[PDB]
From a paper:
Inoviruses are filamentous and rod-shaped, roughly six nm in diameter, that contain a single-stranded DNA (ssDNA) genome. [name] also promotes antibiotic tolerance of [name] by self-assembling into higher-order liquid crystalline structures. The CoaB subunits adopt a 77-Å-long, α-helical structure, with the C-termini pointed toward the core of the phage and the N-termini directed toward the outside of the cylindrical filament.
We used real-space helical reconstruction to resolve a 3.2-Å resolution structure of the [name] phage. Unexpectedly, this density shows that the [name] ssDNA genome is linear, rather than circular ssDNA, which was the expected paradigm for members of the Inoviridae family, since it was proposed for the related bacteriophage Pf1 (10) as well as fd. Analysis of the interaction between CoaB protein subunits and the linear ssDNA genome (in the [name] structure with ssDNA) shows weak contacts between arginine 44 residues and the phosphate backbone of the DNA. The capsid coat itself is comparatively tightly packed, and is maintained by several hydrophobic interactions between the CoaB subunits, which repeat along the filament, likely providing large net stability to the phage structure.
Author numbering:
A (entry chain A), B (entry chain A), C (entry chain A), D (entry chain A), E (entry chain A), F (entry chain A), ...: 1 to 46
The structure:
Amino acid sequence: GVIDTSAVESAITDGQGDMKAIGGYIVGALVILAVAGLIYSMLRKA
Amino acid sequence: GVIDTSAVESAITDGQGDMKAIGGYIVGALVILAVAGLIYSMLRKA
Amino acid sequence: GVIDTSAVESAITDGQGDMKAIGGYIVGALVILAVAGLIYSMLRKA
Amino acid sequence: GVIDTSAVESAITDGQGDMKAIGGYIVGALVILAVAGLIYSMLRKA
Amino acid sequence: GVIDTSAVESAITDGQGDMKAIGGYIVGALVILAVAGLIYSMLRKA
Amino acid sequence: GVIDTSAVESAITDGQGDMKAIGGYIVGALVILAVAGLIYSMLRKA
Amino acid sequence: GVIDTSAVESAITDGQGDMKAIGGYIVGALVILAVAGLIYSMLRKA
Amino acid sequence: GVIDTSAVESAITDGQGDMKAIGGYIVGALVILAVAGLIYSMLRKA
Amino acid sequence: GVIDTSAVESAITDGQGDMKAIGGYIVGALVILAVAGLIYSMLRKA
Amino acid sequence: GVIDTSAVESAITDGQGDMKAIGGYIVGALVILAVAGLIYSMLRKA
Amino acid sequence: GVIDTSAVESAITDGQGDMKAIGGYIVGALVILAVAGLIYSMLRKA
Amino acid sequence: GVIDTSAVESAITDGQGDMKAIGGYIVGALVILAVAGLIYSMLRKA
């Protein structure tokens, strides 16, 4: 009496493979305010 | 069952390319108070 | 058996075109406290 | 399906025009401790 | 088949006219710690 | 459809009248290290 | 068709009378780091 | 409708009685660099 | 034609007497991060 | 009509007994930068 | 007229035994930003 | 009635092994402004 849920794992494993894609696109934008955070500290201490 | 997230990386890679633009516009204004910080020290020691 | 959702994309693409308008009106007000943040530092160091 | 956001830019452009007003009222009070900072140095060196 | 929403704008335009009243009562209390913030700096530098 | 906010201004105008009281109690303690700062300079120069 | 809300004001006026009690217990602990903040400044200037 | 806050004043009056303990342990270490600051001045003037 | 609701007030007055019991068990755990919040401030200022 | 909440106080009194354990492990690490803060001041004044 | 709920406690006591497992896996990742939070403070004070 | 959480510890132990990697990449950049902080002090004292 089953219902075919084969279209579930095919849909959301491709879903969770897309959460990883837009996680790496944020990490690449948070290191901008990490690098610029501490080369401001070099100019101030000088 | 995917949703097209192709408009994400096209939107925020151009976003993080703009954080770099206004980071270099601050560094050019912090060296003003680095140079003027230590040519004041030459006049005082004289 | 469809329902005409043509009035959806006509309504919210004009919606997301208005989020961009009031995003640029905030950026123009946050640079006021960025510029005035570091010309206070010039007067203090003098 | 828009919502009239015409009352937004009319409200905060007049808002950011007021941040400039109270920025210039602080600069006029930080030059007091810049001028008095270095006419104390004239009396001490004498 | 409308429902009279005339009691809405009469109720919340008088509501948002009261948010402005208690916004100006806070600004009058944040300038106390702005003025006293920098007449402490005059006594310390002396 | 208002809510009585008459207990707000009665509560925080008496609040900001108390920030002024403990601001003047600090100024009376910072002039101790201003006066003693420069009658030490008289004894050293002698 | 009312519901007796007489147990409301009896419960939260005694509630807001207790927020005042633990506000005064914090003020008595923030003046410790205000007094000790500026008798450290007397020892350093000496 | 109260909540027993009797465990508050029993917890932080013993808390603020401990801020006083580690304030007096710092004052005993700042007088070391006050005494040694001005018996260096006796050796230099000799 | 009533239905005996005498088992209601006997069940939920003992219910609301138990909400007070686990409210006082949280207040005893929030004062831990209130006391430790400001004896960290004594060590940093020293 | 009660629900047995005897597993509550047994769970969070052991919870708040663990907040005290990791509070004392931080105090032991903030005195490192208190002691080293003022034996740097002895070397500089010498 | 009962219904066998013996499969309930066998299912959720093993459920709450798994909430404890992934609670300890978070605590092991929050101490990374506690240790690195205050060995940054040693390098800055030096 | 369990749910397989074996993919949890495999995912976040590799997660917390990556927090350590980018902690050591910051420590290597804070010692730059520690070394340069005190070879500036040698040039000034000379």
